[PDB]
Design a binder for this molecule. Sequence first.
Ligand SMILES: [Mg+2]
Ligand SMILES: [Mg+2]
Ligand SMILES: [Mg+2]
Ligand SMILES: [Mg+2]
Ligand SMILES: [Mg+2]
Ligand SMILES: [Mg+2]
Ligand SMILES: [Mg+2]
Ligand SMILES: [Mg+2]
Ligand SMILES: [Mg+2]
Ligand SMILES: [Mg+2]
Ligand SMILES: [Mg+2]
Ligand SMILES: [Mg+2]
Ligand SMILES: [Mg+2]
Ligand SMILES: [Mg+2]
Ligand SMILES: [Mg+2]
Ligand SMILES: [Mg+2]
Ligand SMILES: [Mg+2]
Ligand SMILES: [Mg+2]
Ligand SMILES: [Mg+2]
Ligand SMILES: [Mg+2]
Ligand SMILES: [Mg+2]
Ligand SMILES: [Mg+2]
Ligand SMILES: [Mg+2]
Ligand SMILES: [Mg+2]
Ligand SMILES: [Mg+2]
Ligand SMILES: [Mg+2]
Ligand SMILES: [Mg+2]
Ligand SMILES: [Mg+2]
Ligand SMILES: [Mg+2]
Ligand SMILES: [Mg+2]
Ligand SMILES: [Mg+2]
Ligand SMILES: [Mg+2]
Ligand SMILES: [Mg+2]
Ligand SMILES: [Mg+2]
Ligand SMILES: [Mg+2]
Ligand SMILES: [Mg+2]
Ligand SMILES: [Mg+2]
Ligand SMILES: [Mg+2]
Ligand SMILES: [Mg+2]
Ligand SMILES: [Mg+2]
Ligand SMILES: [Mg+2]
Ligand SMILES: [Mg+2]
Ligand SMILES: [Mg+2]
Ligand SMILES: [Mg+2]
Ligand SMILES: [Mg+2]
Ligand SMILES: [Mg+2]
Ligand SMILES: [Mg+2]
Ligand SMILES: [Mg+2]
Ligand SMILES: [Mg+2]
Ligand SMILES: [Mg+2]
Ligand SMILES: [Mg+2]
Ligand SMILES: [Mg+2]
Ligand SMILES: [Mg+2]
Ligand SMILES: [Mg+2]
Ligand SMILES: [Mg+2]
Ligand SMILES: [Mg+2]
Ligand SMILES: [Mg+2]
Ligand SMILES: [Mg+2]
Ligand SMILES: [Mg+2]
Ligand SMILES: [Mg+2]
Ligand SMILES: [Mg+2]
Ligand SMILES: [Mg+2]
Ligand SMILES: [Mg+2]
Ligand SMILES: [Mg+2]
Ligand SMILES: [Mg+2]
Ligand SMILES: [Mg+2]
Ligand SMILES: [Mg+2]
Ligand SMILES: [Mg+2]
Ligand SMILES: [Mg+2]
Ligand SMILES: [Mg+2]
Ligand SMILES: [Mg+2]
Ligand SMILES: [Mg+2]
Ligand SMILES: [Mg+2]
Ligand SMILES: [Mg+2]
Ligand SMILES: [Mg+2]
Ligand SMILES: [Mg+2]
Ligand SMILES: [Mg+2]
Ligand SMILES: [Mg+2]
Ligand SMILES: [Mg+2]
Ligand SMILES: [Mg+2]
Ligand SMILES: [Mg+2]
Ligand SMILES: [Mg+2]
Ligand SMILES: [Mg+2]
Ligand SMILES: [Mg+2]
Ligand SMILES: [Mg+2]
Ligand SMILES: [Mg+2]
Ligand SMILES: [Mg+2]
Ligand SMILES: [Mg+2]
Ligand SMILES: [Mg+2]
Ligand SMILES: [Mg+2]
Ligand SMILES: [Mg+2]
Ligand SMILES: [Mg+2]
Ligand SMILES: [Mg+2]
Ligand SMILES: [Mg+2]
Ligand SMILES: [Mg+2]
Ligand SMILES: [Mg+2]
Ligand SMILES: [Mg+2]
Ligand SMILES: [Mg+2]
Ligand SMILES: [Mg+2]
Ligand SMILES: [Mg+2]
Ligand SMILES: [Mg+2]
Ligand SMILES: [Mg+2]
Ligand SMILES: [Mg+2]
Ligand SMILES: [Mg+2]
Ligand SMILES: [Mg+2]
Ligand SMILES: [Mg+2]
Ligand SMILES: [Mg+2]
Ligand SMILES: [Mg+2]
Ligand SMILES: [Mg+2]
Ligand SMILES: [Mg+2]
Ligand SMILES: [Mg+2]
Ligand SMILES: [Mg+2]
Lengths: 206, 210, 60
Amino acid sequence: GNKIHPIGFRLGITRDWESRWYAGKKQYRHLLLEDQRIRGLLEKELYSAGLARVDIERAADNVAVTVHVAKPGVVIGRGGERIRVLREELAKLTGKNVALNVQEVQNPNLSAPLVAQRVAEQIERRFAVRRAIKQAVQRVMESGAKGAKVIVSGRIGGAEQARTEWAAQGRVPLHTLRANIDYGFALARTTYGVLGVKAYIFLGEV
Amino acid sequence: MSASEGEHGGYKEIIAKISGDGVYGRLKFESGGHRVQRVPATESQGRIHTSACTVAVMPELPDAELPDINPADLRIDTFRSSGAGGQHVNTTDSAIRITHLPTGIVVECQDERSQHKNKAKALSVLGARIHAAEMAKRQQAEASTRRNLLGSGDRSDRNRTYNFPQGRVTDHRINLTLYRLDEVMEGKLDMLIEPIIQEHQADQLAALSE
Amino acid sequence: ARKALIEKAKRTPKFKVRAYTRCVRCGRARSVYRFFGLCRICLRELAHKGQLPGVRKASW
RNA sequence: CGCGGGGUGGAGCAGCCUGGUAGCUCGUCGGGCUCAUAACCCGAAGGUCGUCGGUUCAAAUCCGGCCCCCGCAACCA
RNA sequence: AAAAUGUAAA
RNA sequence: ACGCGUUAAGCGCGCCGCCUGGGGAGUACGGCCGCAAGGCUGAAACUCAAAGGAAUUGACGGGGGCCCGCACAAGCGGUGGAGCAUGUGGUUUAAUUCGAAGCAACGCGAAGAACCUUACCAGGCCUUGACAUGCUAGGGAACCCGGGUGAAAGCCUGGGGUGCCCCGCGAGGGGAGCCCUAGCACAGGUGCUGCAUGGCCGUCGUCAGCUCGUGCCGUGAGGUGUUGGGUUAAGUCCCGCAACGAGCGCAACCCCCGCCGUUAGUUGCCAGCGGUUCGGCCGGGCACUCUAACGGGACUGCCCGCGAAAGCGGGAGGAAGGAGGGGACGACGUCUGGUCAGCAUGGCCCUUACGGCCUGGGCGACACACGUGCUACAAUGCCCACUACAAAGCGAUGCCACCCGGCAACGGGGAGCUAAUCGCAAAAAGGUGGGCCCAGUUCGGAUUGGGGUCUGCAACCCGACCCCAUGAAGCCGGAAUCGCUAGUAAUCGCGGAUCAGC
Ligand SMILES: [Mg+2]
Ligand SMILES: [Mg+2]
Ligand SMILES: [Mg+2]
Ligand SMILES: [Mg+2]
Ligand SMILES: [Mg+2]
Ligand SMILES: [Mg+2]
Ligand SMILES: [Mg+2]
Ligand SMILES: [Mg+2]
Ligand SMILES: [Mg+2]
Ligand SMILES: [Mg+2]
Ligand SMILES: [Mg+2]
Ligand SMILES: [Mg+2]
Ligand SMILES: [Mg+2]
Ligand SMILES: [Mg+2]
Ligand SMILES: [Mg+2]
Ligand SMILES: [Mg+2]
Ligand SMILES: [Mg+2]
Ligand SMILES: [Mg+2]
Ligand SMILES: [Mg+2]
Ligand SMILES: [Mg+2]
Ligand SMILES: [Mg+2]
Ligand SMILES: [Mg+2]
Ligand SMILES: [Mg+2]
Ligand SMILES: [Mg+2]
Ligand SMILES: [Mg+2]
Ligand SMILES: [Mg+2]
Ligand SMILES: [Mg+2]
Ligand SMILES: [Mg+2]
Ligand SMILES: [Mg+2]
Ligand SMILES: [Mg+2]
Ligand SMILES: [Mg+2]
Ligand SMILES: [Mg+2]
Ligand SMILES: [Mg+2]
Ligand SMILES: [Mg+2]
Ligand SMILES: [Mg+2]
Ligand SMILES: [Mg+2]
Ligand SMILES: [Mg+2]
Ligand SMILES: [Mg+2]
Ligand SMILES: [Mg+2]
Ligand SMILES: [Mg+2]
Ligand SMILES: [Mg+2]
Ligand SMILES: [Mg+2]
Ligand SMILES: [Mg+2]
Ligand SMILES: [Mg+2]
Ligand SMILES: [Mg+2]
Ligand SMILES: [Mg+2]
Ligand SMILES: [Mg+2]
Ligand SMILES: [Mg+2]
Ligand SMILES: [Mg+2]
Ligand SMILES: [Mg+2]
Ligand SMILES: [Mg+2]
Ligand SMILES: [Mg+2]
Ligand SMILES: [Mg+2]
Ligand SMILES: [Mg+2]
Ligand SMILES: [Mg+2]
Ligand SMILES: [Mg+2]
Ligand SMILES: [Mg+2]
Ligand SMILES: [Mg+2]
Ligand SMILES: [Mg+2]
Ligand SMILES: [Mg+2]
Ligand SMILES: [Mg+2]
Ligand SMILES: [Mg+2]
Ligand SMILES: [Mg+2]
Ligand SMILES: [Mg+2]
Ligand SMILES: [Mg+2]
Ligand SMILES: [Mg+2]
Ligand SMILES: [Mg+2]
Ligand SMILES: [Mg+2]
Ligand SMILES: [Mg+2]
Ligand SMILES: [Mg+2]
Ligand SMILES: [Mg+2]
Ligand SMILES: [Mg+2]
Ligand SMILES: [Mg+2]
Ligand SMILES: [Mg+2]
Ligand SMILES: [Mg+2]
Ligand SMILES: [Mg+2]
Ligand SMILES: [Mg+2]
Ligand SMILES: [Mg+2]
Ligand SMILES: [Mg+2]
Ligand SMILES: [Mg+2]
Ligand SMILES: [Mg+2]
Ligand SMILES: [Mg+2]
Ligand SMILES: [Mg+2]
Ligand SMILES: [Mg+2]
Ligand SMILES: [Mg+2]
Ligand SMILES: [Mg+2]
Ligand SMILES: [Mg+2]
Ligand SMILES: [Mg+2]
Ligand SMILES: [Mg+2]
Ligand SMILES: [Mg+2]
Ligand SMILES: [Mg+2]
Ligand SMILES: [Mg+2]
Ligand SMILES: [Mg+2]
Ligand SMILES: [Mg+2]
Ligand SMILES: [Mg+2]
Ligand SMILES: [Mg+2]
Ligand SMILES: [Mg+2]
Ligand SMILES: [Mg+2]
Ligand SMILES: [Mg+2]
Ligand SMILES: [Mg+2]
Ligand SMILES: [Mg+2]
Ligand SMILES: [Mg+2]
Ligand SMILES: [Mg+2]
Ligand SMILES: [Mg+2]
Ligand SMILES: [Mg+2]
Ligand SMILES: [Mg+2]
Ligand SMILES: [Mg+2]
Ligand SMILES: [Mg+2]
Ligand SMILES: [Mg+2]
Ligand SMILES: [Mg+2]
Ligand SMILES: [Mg+2]
Ligand SMILES: [Mg+2]
């Protein structure tokens, strides 16, 4: 075990922060402490939405949370009723003037954090791990990707002996900075332990 | 007093006289085999292994070889020796036969021409022979009381298990099984040896009152 | 000693000296970079995650 | 009963003749090598000389008694 | 030419 | 299968000999031969679930060939010995909380243990709890004040506000909220299992490796490709090839350093002038230095020799040349590696306690052993005086100029800076001057006595710092062992993270 995080390695190179704002020194540690609590309620509530990334911006005092989803409708609701109570709970906890924002995810088969969820969800529902990796790596590849790879660790199939299990097509030059790649983690809760889900999507260099 | 070290580590055998108060009372219940389950220090790979050691505790007993012989329990015969000597060997009861009555052990001596030179020798041998005969009795008593206590077999011969991986020690006799083994290895035996003392004492009421 | 102790940390004490800084995410007391209110491990993750603004892999 | 020998660090032996000064090999303990054990290398500890007396400024050493071990002797009838 | 050995459970 | 193949192990016929799982056993008995040694013939009980033949893939070799690394060698400085610091073993203890174990545990989790931290210990305590979501019954009202006993936690207990919602003419009434006393769901656990797991990390290893697709060979495991010659730090490229390609690796793409440029001119800078109260100090200016954002630059492009090519060896011009120096980056996998105690988490277990609070103790113990370290043993030295030259960082809960008091640690005052303004800040080796005389010393600074400063509720256990006195071992270290190949080692100081302080 020795490989670097793909996002952390490509900051300002092929990837931008999921939080963009300045903060001197006296308030950083609670801007962030709140910032973190923001993805708290967001990820917790918008599971059904398939949230792929939370972009939290902060202007003068006011926050500016942009959110990316696969199927947008869940977020909004009948007459946009969930989307209102959304920004309601937000300013209710932040105490700062907030900002609703939603832009959909065009191709759900090209967002690793999405792929990971759908995988981990499957194995939560007793689906064959091996033949489902090849399935996911297919759809992601067949959805135009330049490369794709999925990894699963832990007690596969409920087996006492835990193990790694993965598949891949195309390229995943993880050493190459010039390459853009999407990373995605997920955690499959199970009646027999916990299994980690990793996705790599190579969306061409630049 | 004895300690045969087995290279690393131990003690392939060690014997000690534990002197004090209530020693045989409390350390009595260790007589038998002790199973150990742990990843051995000797292990090349990473496999868990089962091993065992035997413990025998015989109490410190009194012991005293009798004040030699006492002529009261002894028959001495005097008579003529056999073979060379001429005139003198024929007319002189120089042969001795001392029969030690309690054991039936007998010596004879017609070595020298002097009757008490021979009685001396025959008293010397008879001494060494009754001593040696009791020593051997006392030997295969001690040597055979251990055979039972020590429990010949191994891996499966009795008493209690010390499992290092799960941290459980457990006495198979009283079926106690408290899994605070750390302390037990540090000599905190009482939370183990006291349960046996009570359970064994409950087998004393139900013994002539049941 | 865990959630009960993370609560002692939040409580304004009896004497100022008994202040200790916990992690604002995992709850660790040792190795606590105060700039983030985070521990040295919680720090590392979010940094890779890119959820800590401006901070990036150093190199020279 | 008689004559000769012996008892000295845990084992096995020097030193006694010629009084002053305790040695050897092994073992043991601590540190090295080695993944580890041994072999190997470095350093250390350990006896108040069987036991009583006596001689002497001084006794393992010289002298007397006793105890234990060893060898020899014990013939003429 | 140096230089012995490694018990017993995945 | 290896192989055999008109000298068959092929295709056929004739005849003799022989085998029928391993061990027991070529043994026993009997018989025949022999001078003997022994030979020929030749069993059984018993026991095992295999023994065995060829071939495959690895690993291994005190096998071979070719390469490589501070591996040896060549070198400079060290540990091992001394005193101290710290981590560990061990022993000790009421507890000396737990984990880490050769390389890859041992100044490691600890980037801050007096209380706190704290998971251990003794003791006084609490029981729907220090925290979450709810559900009850007497149902009071928020929240400030107090008594009280106490080491605190805790337990007991005295005054109030004269709130709020429905709206009732009304004397009261029911709502909500948080608190309140019991009760029920439940919380809680740094209790076990890293050998039930995720995550992250160490390691072989920055080593050049690891594989897939299809095809072809093989009864098959599998092989071919990946091999071969050249070459390279490199499965790096080249040529060859029953193989043709492809992926993860290597390289590149990223940061930092070295050269030049464009843009920029304060809080930076000062070259010529002006003012000079001989100071970047005012006026003044962006040129240089700097600062920091975008570029340029190097391509084996050029020359010689060799070469089939790849490239190799030299040459030049250049700040820089064949990877310029440094970093970031760690393949398929291996170690039942590490960690359930950062967090996550399946199963297991504790429930007026295996949960919680507090006071005090302990994690700092000391017959001993080790790891890493600091300071030394001195003259290429040490002390005092004076005087220079740094980069990186930190600081409006803070850093502190400068006067004042103090031998000092520091205290009292007090200017500026939220900072390329102002400050910590003195750089230290260096240089100059004076002293020391080869001594257990003006080397050395452990030990201890006395007297103080600061932070803190509080420095007995247990802090750092100052002053006087004390002035130990140590004369260069047995066996053995470590680092480093160029701005490196050695040496010298400075800063920061944690943090009241250390
Ligand atoms: Mg691995
Ligand atoms: Mg790495
Ligand atoms: Mg990666
Ligand atoms: Mg979803
Ligand atoms: Mg081993
Ligand atoms: Mg066994
Ligand atoms: Mg006797
Ligand atoms: Mg008798
Ligand atoms: Mg008679
Ligand atoms: Mg006769
Ligand atoms: Mg007569
Ligand atoms: Mg007569
Ligand atoms: Mg007569
Ligand atoms: Mg006779
Ligand atoms: Mg048993
Ligand atoms: Mg264990
Ligand atoms: Mg057990
Ligand atoms: Mg008791
Ligand atoms: Mg503190
Ligand atoms: Mg003689
Ligand atoms: Mg003589
Ligand atoms: Mg002699
Ligand atoms: Mg004699
Ligand atoms: Mg004698
Ligand atoms: Mg002697
Ligand atoms: Mg002797
Ligand atoms: Mg001799
Ligand atoms: Mg003599
Ligand atoms: Mg003599
Ligand atoms: Mg030794
Ligand atoms: Mg060895
Ligand atoms: Mg004398
Ligand atoms: Mg003498
Ligand atoms: Mg004498
Ligand atoms: Mg003598
Ligand atoms: Mg004598
Ligand atoms: Mg005779
Ligand atoms: Mg004769
Ligand atoms: Mg005669
Ligand atoms: Mg052997
Ligand atoms: Mg053997
Ligand atoms: Mg072994
Ligand atoms: Mg297997
Ligand atoms: Mg063939
Ligand atoms: Mg031919
Ligand atoms: Mg022929
Ligand atoms: Mg032939
Ligand atoms: Mg033929
Ligand atoms: Mg045929
Ligand atoms: Mg057959
Ligand atoms: Mg058979
Ligand atoms: Mg035969
Ligand atoms: Mg034969
Ligand atoms: Mg027969
Ligand atoms: Mg025969
Ligand atoms: Mg014959
Ligand atoms: Mg003959
Ligand atoms: Mg012959
Ligand atoms: Mg013969
Ligand atoms: Mg023979
Ligand atoms: Mg080396
Ligand atoms: Mg060397
Ligand atoms: Mg150690
Ligand atoms: Mg544990
Ligand atoms: Mg009070
Ligand atoms: Mg529960
Ligand atoms: Mg277990
Ligand atoms: Mg793991
Ligand atoms: Mg490790
Ligand atoms: Mg390399
Ligand atoms: Mg490296
Ligand atoms: Mg193939
Ligand atoms: Mg073949
Ligand atoms: Mg390649
Ligand atoms: Mg060829
Ligand atoms: Mg002047
Ligand atoms: Mg000008
Ligand atoms: Mg100008
Ligand atoms: Mg310019
Ligand atoms: Mg440039
Ligand atoms: Mg040619
Ligand atoms: Mg050249
Ligand atoms: Mg470079
Ligand atoms: Mg260079
Ligand atoms: Mg590089
Ligand atoms: Mg495993
Ligand atoms: Mg396992
Ligand atoms: Mg493993
Ligand atoms: Mg209960
Ligand atoms: Mg001067
Ligand atoms: Mg000067
Ligand atoms: Mg610099
Ligand atoms: Mg500082
Ligand atoms: Mg600050
Ligand atoms: Mg304050
Ligand atoms: Mg301060
Ligand atoms: Mg002054
Ligand atoms: Mg003054
Ligand atoms: Mg003054
Ligand atoms: Mg003065
Ligand atoms: Mg001041
Ligand atoms: Mg003033
Ligand atoms: Mg001020
Ligand atoms: Mg100076
Ligand atoms: Mg000296
Ligand atoms: Mg003092
Ligand atoms: Mg104060
Ligand atoms: Mg000393
Ligand atoms: Mg010297
Ligand atoms: Mg000298
Ligand atoms: Mg000297
Ligand atoms: Mg250099």
